[PDB]
Amino acid sequence: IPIFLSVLQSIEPEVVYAGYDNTQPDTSASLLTSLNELGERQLVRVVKWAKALPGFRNLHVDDQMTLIQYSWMGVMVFAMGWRSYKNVNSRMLYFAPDLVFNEQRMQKSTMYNLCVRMRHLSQEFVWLQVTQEEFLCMKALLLFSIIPVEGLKNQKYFDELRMNYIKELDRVISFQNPTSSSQRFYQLTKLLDSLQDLVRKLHQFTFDTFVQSQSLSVEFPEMMSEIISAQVPKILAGMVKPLLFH
Amino acid sequence: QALLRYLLDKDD
Numbered sequence: 001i002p003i004f005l006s007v008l009q010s011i012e013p014e015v016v017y018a019g020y021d022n023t024q025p026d027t028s029a030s031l032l033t034s035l036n037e038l039g040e041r042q043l044v045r046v047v048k049w050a051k052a053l054p055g056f057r058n059l060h061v062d063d064q065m066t067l068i069q070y071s072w073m074g075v076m077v078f079a080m081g082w083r084s085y086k087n088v089n090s091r092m093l094y095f096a097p098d099l100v101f102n103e104q105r106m107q108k109s110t111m112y113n114l115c116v117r118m119r120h121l122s123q124e125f126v127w128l129q130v131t132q133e134e135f136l137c138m139k140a141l142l143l144f145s146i147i148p149v150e151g152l153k154n155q156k157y158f159d160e161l162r163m164n165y166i167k168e169l170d171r172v173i174s175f176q177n178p179t180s181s182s183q184r185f186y187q188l189t190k191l192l193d194s195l196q197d198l199v200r201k202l203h204q205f206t207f208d209t210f211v212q213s214q215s216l217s218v219e220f221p222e223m224m225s226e227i228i229s230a231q232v233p234k235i236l237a238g239m240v241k242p243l244l245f246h
Numbered sequence: 247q248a249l250l251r252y253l254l255d256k257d258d
């Protein structure tokens with residue numbers, strides 16, 4: 001029987017608005033700047049959520065910092081894919097209720113191909129018929145998806161806590177025959193593994209946009225700037241290890 | 247000190 005389902009339901013963040021003026025003519029600068037402002041305010045809620053995930057605050061605070069710095073992109077992309085599934089049947093990217101990317105905005109963004117990939121992630125939710133309960137378990141697992149090559153300060157406890165949430169995904173799938181449930185577990189964890197390559201490409205584009213912030217007129221708010229500076233160079237340099245299920 | 251550290255240390 002699932003042990004964390006009611007917890008994950010209760011601690012799930014409410015939706016964040018971008019504050020975008022949709023009457024203005026879109027530019028790549030306005031669209032990327034708005035996504036960064038949305039990211040900043042989502043990050044505040046991701047931190048509060050992670051702190052309420054049982055066991056997370058029992059890691060060394062340095063490990064807590066590291067995991068949030070590594071995992072915010074995956075958590076936020078995955079949540080956006082779910083919103084796109086639930087609100088627009090994955091036909092557009094529902095970054096926020098007031099910031100929905102249609103094809104025109106994907107093109108104007110200067111990251112069209114990455115937007116297409118994020119829409120294909122969203123489409124996987126449709127084809128797999130991902131349930132809310134699966135989604136919440138999968139999203140919690142994304143906090144545990146990347147570690148330093150040299151390990152965490154409390155790596156043993158992290159390993160055990162990660163396995164506890166892997167077992168929870170399995171418990172939820174079974175709660176909702178064993179052969180079909182093992183196949184379901186394979187499908188959902190393969191989906192999470194596939195997200196790792198997309199997240200890496202998004203980290204590359206983030207770095208490039210950050211380096212070019214002034215020339216592009218794309219502003220990064222303070223905590224996004226801090227967290228990108230803290231780990232995106234290390235991610236690009238090969239200093240982190242994705243943890244794959246397969 | 248970091249903004250992220252503030253958010254991790256604060257109440258809520």
Ligand SMILES: CC(=O)[C@H]1CC[C@H]2[C@@H]3CCC4=CC(=O)CC[C@]4(C)[C@H]3CC[C@]12C
Nearest residue numbers: 032035036039076080095202205206209
């Ligand atoms: C400006 C920029 O470099 C872009 C490249 C990928 C983008 C992110 C892509 C995923 C994403 C989904 C959200 O719902 C919040 C905003 C974020 C977190 C985006 C913020 C802006 C980013 C970082």
